[PDB]
Amino acid sequence: SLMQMAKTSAALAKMQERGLPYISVLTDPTMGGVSASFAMLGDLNIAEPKALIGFAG
Amino acid sequence: SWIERIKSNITPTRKASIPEGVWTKCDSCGQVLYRAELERNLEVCPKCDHHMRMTARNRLHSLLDEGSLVELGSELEPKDVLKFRDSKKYKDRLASAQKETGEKDALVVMKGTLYGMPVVAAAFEFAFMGGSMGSVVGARFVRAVEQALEDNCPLICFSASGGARMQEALMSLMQMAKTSAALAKMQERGLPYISVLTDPTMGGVSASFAMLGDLNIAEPKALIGFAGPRVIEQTVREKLPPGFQRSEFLIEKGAIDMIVRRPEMRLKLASILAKLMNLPAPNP
Amino acid sequence: GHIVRSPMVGTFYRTPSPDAKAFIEVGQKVNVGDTLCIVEAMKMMNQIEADKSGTVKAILVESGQPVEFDEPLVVIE
Amino acid sequence: NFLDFEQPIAELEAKIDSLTAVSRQDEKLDINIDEEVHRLREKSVELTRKIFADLGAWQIAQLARHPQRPYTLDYVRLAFDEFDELAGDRAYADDKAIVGGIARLDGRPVMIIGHQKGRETKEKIRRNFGMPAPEGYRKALRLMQMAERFKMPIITFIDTPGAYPGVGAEERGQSEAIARNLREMSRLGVPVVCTVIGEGGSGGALAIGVGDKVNMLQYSTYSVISPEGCASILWKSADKAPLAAEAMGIIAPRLKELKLIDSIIPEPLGGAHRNPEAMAASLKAQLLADLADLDVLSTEDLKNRRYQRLMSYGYA
Amino acid sequence: MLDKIVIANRGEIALRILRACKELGIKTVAVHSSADRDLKHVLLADETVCIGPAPSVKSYLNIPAIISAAEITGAVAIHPGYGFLSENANFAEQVERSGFIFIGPKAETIRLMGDKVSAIAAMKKAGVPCVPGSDGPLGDDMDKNRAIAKRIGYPVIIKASGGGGGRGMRVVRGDAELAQSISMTRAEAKAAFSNDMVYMEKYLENPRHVEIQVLADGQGNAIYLAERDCSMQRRHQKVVEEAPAPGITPELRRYIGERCAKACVDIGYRGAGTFEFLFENGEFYFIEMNTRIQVEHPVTEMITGVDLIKEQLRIAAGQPLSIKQEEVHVRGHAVECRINAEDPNTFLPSPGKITRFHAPGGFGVRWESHIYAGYTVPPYYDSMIGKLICYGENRDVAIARMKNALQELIIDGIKTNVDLQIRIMNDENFQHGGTNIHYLEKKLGLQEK
Ligand SMILES: CC(=O)SCCNC(=O)CCNC(=O)[C@H](O)C(C)(C)COP(=O)(O)OP(=O)(O)OC[C@H]1O[C@@H](n2cnc3c(N)ncnc32)[C@H](O)[C@@H]1OP(=O)(O)O
Ligand SMILES: Nc1ncnc2c1ncn2[C@@H]1O[C@H](COP(=O)(O)OP(=O)(O)O)[C@@H](O)[C@H]1O
């Protein structure tokens, strides 16, 4: 699973360099690997109210 | 009985003459110094190791090898148009500084070589109206960057200024963008640009190209920042932290790469540039 | 009281320049921060600042008279 | 300070120390030191094999945390020269839990990024137990970009308990910084090699570990979560950490078969700590070999291969 | 002649220089520290200047304060003596340039010969034999270091080229600790003398310390006076020094003296200085040059009849040598015995007050010091409080007088190294004369049960 973060990051880079936007909307819970992989990486980071977002529980 | 003497006083009439320019002082510690010793230890008080001012031409000579020096932008001179009427006339200060320091403006540029490797250097003569970044300063900066771009060779500079040249008003401010554009044009090429900060590095110069090079080498106990300590003191109306805007503090706060003392500087630049340019290591 | 003493060796001058008013003179008291004399050494005319605010009772030296380390200069009562 | 299972090795060492004193201590005492030294060293060498033959994954983790070991500073000193440490993120601080710099490897210039737990208590607390706040990872990104720009290879060491779980670390975009790191490193035009010296893992380690090659010592654990954490969440306890270590597959050979790491660098007997110089030499040889067969490929082919290898991640 | 000079030193050498100055009619200026207010030479001097507080660095090494004194009093030269600022080439440069005359060699030779390795190199170039060794400062090429060690032959010794006072030297038994020993020796040199230069030189196990005194005016004249021998040492620090040395036939005397004179001419040496050596099996291996006036200068004065300090003060006044090589004669034999404030065994300084004191006197006995009753030894500098001598027409007579003088001598209030001097004098081998430098170190013995 851990390695998948890099795969997702590489794909997102491949797309951002193209010009296609990638908006990631965070919803509780957004924590640990997912938060630090592509949750926080898109052009925009839209957090729905009162949602729990971070890295460490 | 000599064991018990009178403790006589000295006779004032006795008089010996020492040459005037052979003994200097270090106000940082108070130890009188032998001028030739201080000048041979790159203007570094060997007692308290407190760095002091150095002449721009002396600095360039110190770094560059001997006999390869080539000054750049020597025909550029101030051409005040704002006729700024201060308590003095801006032309008055311009001429006074030019004659007192022997340099047209704060910045001097001298193409040269480092351990057989071509390089371009420059520095600020802080004595020149606080070493402000005048129009000529930015123009010479552009000239040096252009020289570096045309001839593949790292470009180096040293920072010493109290802020942009007020008397030229917005003309100086705009130069920051010119310098930034030139530095971008060079960084995109692959030619490193190392800027070594020296006290004082403040105001426009600090925020223009002092902090912009690949590396940011702050000489110890140097004052680096953006807003002068008096301005911040009046604004926050409080006590600034100890070591404020000090290289030993701005390496703690991430803005400053590495603290290098002046004697190593030439080797430190030579080794780092010979690495980055991917050239064989220099021979001591 | 207290005696302030030269911390270095050199010629003793009270007027900063050949024809100048003395930094201090008997009578007028000084404060902690003020220059009291000039101790020339190698043409670098240094200066001496008191540490205890009080009256200048007297001056134990005279201009042109060399002084040594810890040489008493002025006594403050 | 040897571990609990390295006791027989210890007491034999404890007899060995006072041999120096007995050489010139007092009362004319200068005994035939050489004979006793040779016999006791023979016994100690024989016994360590009797001790390090039967260690498994829970131990491996203990050895990976031996409080006497080479950190990135040690490997830099013992395999690298002309080392220049760049400290500073340019934003808010330089971090002591990460040390980076530019050095030479057999003439060749390289970039070195890795963690440094500090040796004793003082340098451990000054470096936050090798736990980097995000500013550290921003610094690592900055250095990696610099290395990419000047056609320079990157050598990275990875020895971190994990990204710091603290207020200051979370406030400053920990997740954001690590995401960016994982994004940029996957586009550099320069080869990347990354070891797993010491104890590493927990994602934050991956911030500087996405490269063409990956290598790991024989006693280095690379776990998405520390065994104790997995034990607490799943086993509902802490004492059952060894079971978690056995299940997860945190040991190098277990990972090796998983196509996750490209090579294991064998250690000196009893752990690399007994012969740090030998470990440094082995690491330097492995790094040079990795770089060699890597420089043949061009930058475009390098990046394409890197991307392809990433996609191989996961059985899917 | 020099119209006035400053005694930039303290004590035995200070008082001795003061006597020489008053003899030659050259007024004197005593630069003292605040603790050394009531020294003998201070009280017997024309004009006394205080330059700093008790510590050496604040007061006596305060080159600025010394030059201040020299300028205010109107001197036209300065005598540093030995110790404090004896070999500080930079002090020589500053004194030269400030406008005064540095009594001694020109700073250039101070720099060339204060670096031991450059000194040995120039000596090799000038024909003076040298000890096998690195032949250069040690680098970080451990392979080359061990190759040289194998070439010269173990054991070996590490010596800091900028070290002084018999400190900063370590003996290396093998390559096992060669790197660590070198590192710690360099660290000690950096800490003490601020200089890191270290070099490798062969180790000799049976040396007989020799040193030949030379006077050169710096104008192409260089002469060599009698020999010396400081064989007896404790921690490489001399205690007893006999001049000339037993068994040095006049052939060897003149042979080495001519080479040393040629060396002084080549270096263009100015002032009084001494080429140390090391002796065994009829060979000489240069090891250093003390480009100053040594401590055991008397033991050449009483056998040659020439006052060295007066020769120095004449050279500094520009006068060439007034003594030819032939006209110099060694008539007899001498011996010297330093007195120091240490514990006779522990070798811990024991500064204090001297309640009672009584010079030896008597024929042939010379007492150099400043001590006297009521003189509280300052616990702030070297531990020497007198250089006692006993000149005889042969070694037996000179030792005899020494024994008698030491019997007479009383110094009370502070422990001192008189017992040890008596015991050395009574030693059979020493009375024979010709022991190796270690002799005293070996007598020390070792552990007992
Ligand atoms: C907004 C700007 O960019 S310019 C604003 C001025 N600068 C700042 O606010 C930043 C720092 N402020 C300062 O006062 C200094 O630079 C400090 C804090 C480093 C102090 O350094 P100091 O040793 O006090 O130097 P100082 O300010 O006296 O500079 C020396 C001379 O340069 C002059 N000077 C310095 N900067 C400038 C400037 N930007 N424009 C005009 N003159 C200047 C000063 O007027 C002074 O002249 P003077 O001695 O003949 O009166
Ligand atoms: N190469 C050597 N071999 C043996 N002994 C030596 C050697 N060099 C120095 N020594 C010992 O140390 C003493 C002092 O050496 P020297 O170089 O004069 O040092 P210092 O500058 O401390 O007086 C010598 O008299 C000798 O006894």
Ligand SMILES: *C(=O)CCCC[C@@H]1SC[C@@H]2NC(=O)N[C@@H]21
């Ligand atoms: C240099 O000529 C040495 C003598 C010191 C001259 C200076 S001028 C300033 C002081 N005033 C004075 O009378 N002498 C001192």
Ligand SMILES: [Mg+2]
């Ligand atoms: Mg010696």
Ligand SMILES: [Zn+2]
């Ligand atoms: Zn200073």
